[PDB]
Structures are given as structure tokens and as C-alpha cells.
């Protein structure tokens, strides 16, 4: 076709095929789950290793003391976006001496990601994120897509076989608000486990957890540090 | 400002433009170079005298600096541009290091220039391959070959251009410490290698040599004829 080579070409159905191709690029990555309670936000990601001797790729990255993102898609675009987030947060702290609200950071991300989708010879950022953070208005979970569109979510999962996690979260969304930190982390892990095939399990070497809360700066748990949560399956 | 990607990847991972530059150098004239014990030689096959062309203005052997020369094969104009850039670089190096350039330094600079040209925007790869020979301050002779891809290797004897494979096979079969025993034997080796490709022989040969602590010298046609007669 002649309508699926540039991002400045409209299809006769009002679709920009490159944006859906970037969406597919996001959907072909590893699965992540994010969920929030009335006092906490949890990011759970499933890391994939190229070979048995290759360290599992990291997926939860710091942004500030109150923001963290899980990535699903191109790693270079992920790092570029993370650097932009960090610079924006540092600028906000330097100028105003206050944490940057998560919603404003997501808005800036959307504005930045829009520009490529409207200019010649530029590609959308082939990465989808799950921002988790705590601001003055409580915990937040946001989802970003290469289409420069974002949504405020109670819970979400993006990546390969993420529909099973989405169905689980929808079924069990009622209890999320009134759940201790351990219960919420276990719910996120259960959502992530549903994505795995039958012959695979959640080990300490392929699970990452990111907690942010009122009295808990954003922390990344990996390796043996995720054992306490895994116990109780 | 032209900002188009002239050189791009293709399935199977080939930079087709660089392959076409290789083809261009293949279609070019023939050049030979041999590293001796105390002498470095360069040979070039003249396409045709034409009986009315000044040999002074068609030389394919040039001196980048006092201790470095190089002969090329491919498109002449790109060779001229590369020669000028290399000369400017040699002068700058002598200015800011207070020591004469080494052969390795200048070949690496030329290779870097070619790489930049095969990865930049709106510009095609260079279509020449250069044999760079000279003497370092330590007195050790050197000989390097550079390709449009930006790859440079150190050779003891190589050929580029038309009939590169045939001359290279001849050199491999007929290169030994015995053949590099004396300077005259080395020049005879270069002439013999060139004669494996050039039809007329003798008349259609351009030969230059550099000795240790001596300026680059182009052998006059009489000397080339004398060596050709000696070979036969």
C-alpha cells in the first residue's frame, strides 16, 4: 500500500498507519501491570532474557522521588523519554522547589510525543509507559501510547498477552482501594501471572516491583528483594 | 541543505552504495605497491599515453608529505579531494605535535573521512581505494590500503583496481625475503607484477619509489625501459 510509509499520510479511512504500527511495536514487548490503592501505586513487570546467560532486561526506571515508569517497547525511545521526564522534574524542582504533579508530566510527555506524528520523515516513539506516582491528590497510574494519547487508569496492563491481566484487573478492581501494600502487590503479581503461558512461573529472577506512597519514596525491588511478595501464592 | 540518506541498509545488511563504490574502483586503473627492506615502491598502469597528454598532469602517485606518498584507483576527482584533505591534515599534525606524521595516522584519518562520507546525509561515498606508503620516524617502512568502506589494513604487498585479484595472486606466489633482498629486485618485482595485467608493457607504466630519508622520486621512462629489458 501507499498509505503506510509516512506519518504525514492519511488513509482513506482516516487512519495514520504508522501510529498503529508503533502500537503493535508496543504490544510486542513484555507484559507489565500497574495498579493503585487509596495510598499506594504498584508497578509490576515481567522481564525477559535473550538467553539463559543474559541478565533479564530492566523495565522499571526511576524518574523522580515520586514518579516511576515501566516500559513496553523500544528501549532507546524508553531511555529518551525517561531522560525527558527527569529533566522536566529537575527543572520543576529547581524553579518552584516542589514536586511536579504526575498529570502535568504526562501532559508534557503527550505534547512531546505528538510532534513526530505530524511532521515529515519522523517516527512515533515506539514505547508505551505506565507512570506511577504520588502527588498532593493521591496516588496515580497513567498509561501512555505512541499515538501521543494518555489515560488515567485505576489499573492497566500493556504488553504481550496483556488482555488476560486486564480481564483480571477488571474482575478484581473493587478491592484495590481498600488493600494493604502486600495485598495490592499480590494482586498485581496475580494479574501478571495470568499473562504467562502454562509452563512458566514467576521467579525472583524475572519479576520487578515498584512501590510509591505517602511515606515511601519510589523504590525498585528486584532479585532476592522481591522474595517477600512472591511468597503467598 | 540536502538532508537525504544516500547510503542506507538493505535486506541481508548491505550498503549498496559502498558496493557500487567498490565496483567503481574495480573499473579504475591498476595500482601496485610493495614494501621492501629499505625501500617502498608504487606502480600504476597508464590507460594510454595518447601521444598528446602531458604526463605531469595525470600522475596517479602523489606525496601527502615529505615521508608519505600514496597511489589511488577509481575516480580521479575524489582522489584529488582526498589528497588535499590528507595534506592539510599532515600539516596540521606537524603544527600541533611538532613531529612528522606517521603512515598509520594519515591512513586512519583518510579512512575516518571515508566512513563519515558513507554515513553522513546527502553525500555519496568516495569511489577510490588508496595505497599509502612511507617511513615513520623510527625508520620502519610501512604500507597500508584503504577502501571506500573506511577499512584500513597494513600490507606488505597489495594491488588495487582492475586486475587486482590477478596481481595479488602473482604477488602472493612471488613474494619472499629473497625478492626483497635489494632495491633493484623490488622494483623488478613491481614491474613484473604490473606486466601481468598491462598489455603493451613498459610504455604503459608509471613507477615511483621512496627511500629512507630521501624525497619521492619518479623513475624516468628510460629507467623503466631498462628494468623491463632486465626482466626479459
Amino acid at each position: 500500500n501507499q498509505y503506510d510509509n509516512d506519518v504525514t499520510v492519511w488513509s482513506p479511512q482516516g487512519r495514520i498507519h504508522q501510529i498503529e504500527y508503533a502500537m503493535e511495536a508496543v504490544k510486542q514487548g513484555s507484559a507489565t501491570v500497574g495498579l493503585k490503592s487509596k495510598t499506594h501505586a504498584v508497578l509490576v513487570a515481567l522481564k525477559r532474557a535473550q538467553s539463559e546467560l543474559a541478565a533479564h532486561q530492566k523495565k522499571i526506571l526511576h524518574v523522580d522521588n515520586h514518579i516511576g515508569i515501566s516500559i513496553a517497547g523500544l528501549t532507546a525511545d524508553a531511555r529518551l523519554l525517561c531522560n525527558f521526564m527527569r529533566q522536566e522534574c529537575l527543572d520543576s524542582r529547581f524553579v518552584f522547589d516542589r514536586p511536579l504533579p504526575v498529570s502535568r508530566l504526562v501532559s508534557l510527555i503527550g505534547s512531546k510525543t505528538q510532534i513526530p506524528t505530524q511532521r515529515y520523515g519522523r517516527r512515533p516513539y515506539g514505547v508505551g509507559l505506565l507512570i506511577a506516582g504520588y502527588d498532593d491528590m493521591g496516588p496515580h497510574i497513567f498509561q501512555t501510547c505512541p499515538s501521543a494519547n494518555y489515560f488515567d487508569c485505576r489499573a492497566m496492563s500493556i504488553g504481550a498477552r496483556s488482555q488476560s491481566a486486564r480481564t483480571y484487573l477488571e474482575r478484581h478492581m473493587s478491592e484495590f482501594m481498600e488493600c494493604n501494600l502486600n495485598e495490592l502487590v499480590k494482586h498485581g503479581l496475580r494479574a501478571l501471572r495470568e499473562t504467562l503461558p502454562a509452563e512458566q512461573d514467576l521467579t525472583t529472577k524475572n519479576v520487578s516491583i515498584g512501590i510509591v506512597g505517602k511515606d515511601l519514596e519510589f523504590t525498585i525491588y528486584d532479585d532476592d528483594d522481591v522474595s517477600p511478595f512472591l511468597e503467598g501464592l | 541543505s540536502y538532508d537525504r540518506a544516500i547510503t542506507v541498509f538493505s535486506p541481508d545488511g548491505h550498503l549498496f552504495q559502498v558496493e557500487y563504490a567498490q565496483e567503481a574502483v574495480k573499473k579504475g586503473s591498476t595500482a601496485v605497491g610493495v614494501r621492501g627492506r629499505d625501500i617502498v615502491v608504487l606502480g600504476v598502469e597508464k590507460k594510454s599515453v595518447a601521444k598528446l597528454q602531458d604526463e605531469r598532469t595525470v600522475r596517479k602517485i602523489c606525496a601527502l608529505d615529505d615521508n608519505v606518498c600514496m597511489a589511488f584507483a577509481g575516480l580521479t576527482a575524489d582522489a584529488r579531494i582526498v589528497i588535499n584533505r590528507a595534506r592539510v591534515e599532515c600539516q596540521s599534525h606537524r603544527l600541533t605535535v611538532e613531529d612528522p606524521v606517521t603512515v598509520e595516522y594519515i591512513t586512519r584519518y583518510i579512512a575516518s573521512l571515508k566512513q563519515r562520507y558513507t554515513q553522513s546525509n546527502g553525500r555519496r561515498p568516495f569511489g577510490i581505494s588508496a595505497l599509502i606508503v612511507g617511513f615513520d620516524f623510527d625508520g620502519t617502512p610501512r604500507l597500508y590500503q584503504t577502501d571506500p568502506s573506511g577499512t584500513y589494513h597494513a600490507w606488505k604487498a597489495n594491488a588495487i583496481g582492475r586486475g587486482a585479484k590477478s596481481v595479488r595472486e602473482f604477488l602472493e606466489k612471488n613474494y619472499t625475503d629473497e625478492a626483497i633482498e635489494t632495491d633493484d629486485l623490488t622494483i623488478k618485482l613491481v614491474i613484473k607484477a604490473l606486466l601481468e595485467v598491462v598489455q603493451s608493457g613498459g610504455k604503459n607504466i608509471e613507477l615511483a619509489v621512496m627511500r629512507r630519508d630521501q624525497s619521492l622520486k619518479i623513475l624516468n621512462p628510460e629507467e623503466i625501459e631498462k628494468y623491463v629489458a632486465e626482466i626479459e
Binding site: 529547581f94 524553579v95 518552584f96 522547589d97 516542589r98 504533579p101 498529570s103 502535568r104 501532559s107 502527588d135 498532593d136 491528590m137 | -
Partner: protein, 212 residues
């Protein structure tokens, strides 16, 4: 502003139990000439902040415009986040320091007050970027005349009520009118409380004894 043209006199500030009070005379002086006598030198940044400015009045207008536009742009978003007085103080400090570095200073000396999260805020921003927070502030000639009275009262009684703060501000303004040569009788009082920002019209120092 390399050369100031129309300038204001000191701006006072004292924090009480449940807000802050700022006073500034209505006067624009062109070098020993009360050219403008009905200009307000107190700004209401938002529902929980205020800003009184000394020095050049044109630069005060510029800061007023920029800060108002910032507050508006924030409100349009409607995300439930308010620029805290500390945020405005930090932004002002950064702007003044940047202008100083560029060698094009904003000739002003502002006093920022606010009430957020059940805590009073009182900041000082200088032309050169000097920033600090203290219970009492006094710019210009107030630092020599009015500040001692406020500091003595606060040291004797760290926590003051609203009426005591207002009386202290009135006394300090009276002293300034007595002793400062670029001062005016008419002045404004601004207060920030949990109820918001209120600015009192043109008051007077009629309690001016002149026993000679």
C-alpha cells in the same frame, strides 16, 4: 532596569496566628516628587498568596503580568494543584537571580505572604536574588526604622494575634511617615487568611502627634 525612574518605599510584613499582614503606601516617587499618589503596590497572586513590591513600579507591573498569566495558566488546567506561596517565592528568586546574571536587573524588593496547609509564609526577594523567610520583614528604609519594633515585639511575644499584628503595622507605618522622606500618608493593608486575600482601601495615619 539599569536606572530606576518611579519607585516605591518600604513594604512591611508580619505573620500572626492564622495568616500574614502586608502594608504598602500608595506612592510613586520620581526622585523626590510624589508624582503618582493613588497606585497600589500590593498584588493578590491567588487565593493563598500576596505580593508587595518596592523599587521600580514598571518592573512591578511586569512581574504582576507574568505572575498573573502563570497563575491563570495553572488554573485553566484544573488539576487540583495550587502554586504554594513557597513555589511563588522560589520562582521570583530564580527570575531575579537570572536577571542579575544577565546584567539587566529587575529593580525591586518584594515581600511575599501566604497561608497554605495551616502554615503562614513570609518571604523576602531582593534585586540580586537574596531570598530568606522570617517572621517579620521590612524593605527599603523600613529595615532601619520599622524592623526593630517588629523584632522586639516578636522576641517578647513570638505568636501574635491578628489585632496585635494590625496595630503593630499601623505603628510602624506611622513611624515611617514620621521619618522617611519618600513616604505618604495614604497606605494599604493586605491580609491573607484561610478565608482568602483581603485588601483594605486607602487608610491614613491621622494619629500623627506633632508637639513642637
Amino acid at each position: 532596569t539599569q536606572n530606576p525612574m518611579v519607585t516605591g518605599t518600604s513594604v512591611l510584613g508580619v505573620k500572626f496566628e492564622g495568616g500574614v499582614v502586608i502594608a504598602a503606601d500608595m506612592l510613586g516617587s520620581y526622585g523626590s516628587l510624589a508624582r503618582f499618589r493613588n497606585i497600589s503596590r500590593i498584588m493578590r497572586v491567588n487565593n493563598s498568596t500576596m505580593l508587595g513590591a518596592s523599587g521600580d513600579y514598571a518592573d512591578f507591573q511586569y512581574l504582576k503580568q507574568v505572575l498573573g498569566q502563570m497563575v491563570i495558566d495553572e488554573e485553566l488546567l484544573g488539576d487540583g494543584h495550587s502554586y504554594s506561596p513557597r513555589a511563588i517565592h522560589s520562582w521570583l528568586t530564580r527570575a531575579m537571580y537570572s536577571r542579575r546574571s544577565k546584567m539587566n536587573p529587575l529593580w525591586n524588593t518584594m515581600v511575599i505572604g501566604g497561608y497554605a496547609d495551616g502554615e503562614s509564609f513570609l518571604g523576602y526577594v531582593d534585586m540580586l536574588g537574596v531570598a530568606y523567610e522570617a517572621p517579620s520583614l521590612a524593605t527599603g528604609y523600613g529595615a532601619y526604622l520599622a524592623q526593630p519594633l517588629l523584632r522586639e515585639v516578636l522576641e517578647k511575644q513570638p505568636v501574635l494575634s491578628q489585632t496585635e499584628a494590625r496595630d503593630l503595622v499601623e505603628r510602624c507605618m506611622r513611624v515611617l511617615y514620621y521619618r522617611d522622606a519618600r513616604s505618604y500618608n495614604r497606605f494599604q493593608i493586605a491580609t491573607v487568611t484561610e478565608k482568602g486575600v483581603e485588601i483594605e482601601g486607602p487608610l491614613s495615619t491621622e494619629t500623627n502627634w506633632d508637639i513642637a
